[PDB]
RNA sequence: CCUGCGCCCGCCGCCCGCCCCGACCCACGUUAGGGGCGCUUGCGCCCCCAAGGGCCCGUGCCAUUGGCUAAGCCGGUCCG
RNA sequence: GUAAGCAGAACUGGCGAUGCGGGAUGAACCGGAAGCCGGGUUACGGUGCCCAACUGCGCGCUAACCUAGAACCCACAAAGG
RNA sequence: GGCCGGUACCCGCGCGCCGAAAGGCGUGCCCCUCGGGGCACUGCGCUGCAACGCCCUGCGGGCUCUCCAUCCGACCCGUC
């Protein structure tokens, strides 16, 4: 903790991928569901509505010198009364992504 | 033995809803769930015990007392002052003040608190080594 | 704020008829959730009592009654007729509430809880602010004392708003009445 | 129940006097969202309904066995850790890869086996007995149920917990001593620094 | 009053007043001038086979991008993206193309005067007095790249030859940084602690909710 | 017991892979009660609602060249 | 006809020819009818987990030492205490 | 704040000036009469919105082909 190695500033709030917008017997892979760490209510996700996020994973082959990958997306609208958001990405996430971390920056700010 | 009762006079914090934080005097009891609460800024109204957190300040007043006598009794028992100096009543005020800090103020607070950490570290080391 | 019921008073009469071209005027004090529901319940009662149907009837006015002093607690009495699963019955219910409107909503919920009677089944015969020293019912009459005092045996712990709500709280809550 | 969203590497849960079903639904949603839990002191879980009702329920659960090969059908566990684990398996879809990977994150123990002794044990307010049952209704402890069902290690867990409790009493008195000395140290710095430290006064308590 | 602005703009009389048909009633008599037949080129070098379309001079005149209300020349901003993410800088003025123009100052943050998009910055409630700084010398051409030819591929031999040479930002930008840095440090020391503040970088340490955080 | 050309163990010079971004915090116990500090060991004082708190250079391009270095803090490592 | 997931009739609609959302599963029950896509909002049905939605805000009733009770059709229980 | 769209017509630009620019600037008649507001004479033409990036034989870009994983769906067809 003290004298640690890693990123020295976090300008992004963590979030967990939580699934897809799904009915009881359908999935709509176009939009994913995201839980932002620290947001608990429907009004507060109205602030993040717009602030883009990044799914950062890492593949097996090295391309452009790195295994790390990034898929880009943003918080479209709230999803429910408990601070869950719908996230729209450039290309739909893998189903394996649910449960993993996602970075939610503040770029399109105000 | 119980240390806090619902009875005519006792001021309670309002601990839920749009109106968090207000202090209200229980001027009457509707039934076993609801009460009449009155305040200097707010007109007397019914409000539920589940939305009332009672406090330790009581005021010696009538039943459903007139607004003027309720005010005069409230400063007679200096409820706002006593609440503010109470540790409980200071908790809410300090959380609002910490809510009000902007970035430069928060940076000055960080700098002020790092030196305090170093100071208490120095002092604790000295006193521990002092105590043989 | 918002009241689920309102007490209207509704005045109506039969259509003018070239025999007796001035029909008699009927006034009623109704409870309903809004104007159209009050009117629709009004024609119910005039059809089953005064033999007047809406088609051969005419609505003169609907007005909404409000409470004189919402800031004072009042002992209310409601004489009500209801339909059980096996017939009809007559009840008296006493409440304490700052408004007759809130007391009536209290009574509908209490009837739907104590007797599984839905609102389509309850007819409020009469409402009267039955002041104290005349209340017949234990639950109301036991709150008639100055120097009343009691604790909160049952109080929820819950963040003041939803924002403070966390799944994990390191410390056991401190409850004391 | 949406998920805590905390980023801890593991979350340790002091399951004493919590409700089996609700603690298990909260934990199940934590696991499905991906957070690794470790529920300890599982033997102390309170369950609504009398001990007699839970006894009768668990013996109905015992009669259920595959006729033509008993070893194949229901596997009736006895340890409180395993009974809770089965309960959470009830809420998790365990016939899918997501489901089995979900239960992989779940470690349930009786007592608090190290290295979970030297770890703050987080409780779940949404399931405490004090806040979830009305004081006066009959309930039972999962440990007392399992003892009466065929778990033969009740005495062992009692022995290990009495040892752990006294060993923690000693350390807590040590931290009382250290805390009073640190209180003295905080005032030592406070009366040493004046105007330099006013800024913390309106946000301190 | 966007609607009232729209009505006042849409009024016929005020459309006359804006398009300025008067003072076109000045030059060309007391009547509006005629137009003619320009473009007598009559020299087409090449005849395209498909229906001919010429290039567009965009006659549409976009509104300049608006600045935030909470941004005033003299604010301390928070960068968010790029290599300077988290750096706390000073907003000098909005340059003419629509982007913010910021300074570190370069002595303390290492962030020079640089162009940053308004999206990727957050206002802070703090202000500095920069009445005494000269900025008019700054414009878009100051930053216009004039990117060189794509015939240079950066190889291993160039990787550190560029680093060990100074064929980089030319010396007049160096010189510029000195004047702005001096003229703004003189006013930064007036505010206590602000030098340390700008030296720091903004980090979102655990238990910090941005929507809860003021700025 | 651990392969006579096989392997095990220690050191440091490092390349990678994986995790992560402060991936910091040990009371039991009841909740119609409890907690901390003092002395009649019973009585006082103060506090209890939520960790919603504490702690921590927390501030350096995961971090420029150098030099010195109190006290303190932390990491590795020896020993007990 | 004792009754029948029984036989024969009347008005209407459905299934057959029909997907789709809900009723756990069901041809005809509830909503609803359809080109392929993006966005928003709904019907029926729900918001503890499975499972997207609240362990939301209120008031009562129930304590089941019988598998307490928990969905229009519906998958039942009575007379009586 | 989301999704779509970016112009031959609705908008818009030029035929005057000031203004980096949003834009401001004329005359005459009605209204309040402060602030200013309303109305008006109206003509020729032209009329596909922009700024800046990344990469360009690359460990690049993307593929409707192949294998595999994961979430959701999903009973085996012809037939009486
Ligand atoms: Mg056929
Ligand atoms: Mg759609
Ligand atoms: Mg869900």
Automatic annotation (TrEMBL), chain A:
Keywords: Ribonucleoprotein, Ribosomal protein. GO terms for molecular function: mRNA binding; structural constituent of ribosome. Coiled coil: none annotated. Gene3D superfamilies: translation elongation factor selb, chain A, domain 4. One of its GO terms (biological process) is ribosomal large subunit biogenesis. PROSITE patterns: RIBOSOMAL_L35AE. The keyword Ribosomal protein applies. It comes from the Eukaryota. One of its GO terms (cellular component) is cytosolic large ribosomal subunit. Belongs to the eukaryotic ribosomal protein eL33 family. This is Ribosomal protein L35A. It comes from Triticum aestivum.
TrEMBL record, chain B:
One of its GO terms (biological process) is ribosomal large subunit biogenesis. The gene is LOC123054002. InterPro entries: Rib_uL2_dom2, Ribosomal_eL14, Ribosomal_eL14_dom, Translation_prot_SH3-like_sf. GO terms for molecular function: mRNA binding; RNA binding; structural constituent of ribosome. This is Large ribosomal subunit protein eL14 domain-containing protein. Belongs to the eukaryotic ribosomal protein eL14 family. Signal peptide: none annotated. GO terms for cellular component: cytosolic large ribosomal subunit. Pfam families: Ribosomal_L14e. The keyword Ribonucleoprotein applies. Keywords: Ribonucleoprotein, Ribosomal protein. Residues 44-116 form the Large ribosomal subunit protein eL14 domain. The keyword Nucleotide-binding does not apply.
TrEMBL record, chain C:
Residues 6-127 form the Large ribosomal subunit protein eL20 domain. Keywords: Ribonucleoprotein, Ribosomal protein. It holds the Pfam family Ribosomal_L18A. The keyword Ubl conjugation does not apply. The keyword Transcription regulation does not apply. InterPro entries: Ribosomal_eL20 (IPR028877), Ribosomal_eL20_dom (IPR023573), Ribosomal_eL20_eukaryotes (IPR021138). One of its GO terms (cellular component) is cytosolic large ribosomal subunit. One of its GO terms (biological process) is cytoplasmic translation. One of its GO terms (molecular function) is structural constituent of ribosome. Belongs to the eukaryotic ribosomal protein eL20 family. PANTHER family: 60S RIBOSOMAL PROTEIN L18A (PTHR10052). This is 60S ribosomal protein L18a.
UniProtKB/TrEMBL annotation, chain D:
GO terms for cellular component: cytosolic large ribosomal subunit; ribosome. InterPro entries: Ribosomal_uL13 (IPR005822), Ribosomal_uL13_CS (IPR023563), Ribosomal_uL13_euk/arc (IPR005755), Ribosomal_uL13_sf (IPR036899). GO terms for molecular function: mRNA binding; structural constituent of ribosome. PROSITE patterns: RIBOSOMAL_L13. Keywords: Ribonucleoprotein, Ribosomal protein. Belongs to the universal ribosomal protein uL13 family. This is Ribosomal protein L13a. The gene is LOC606336.
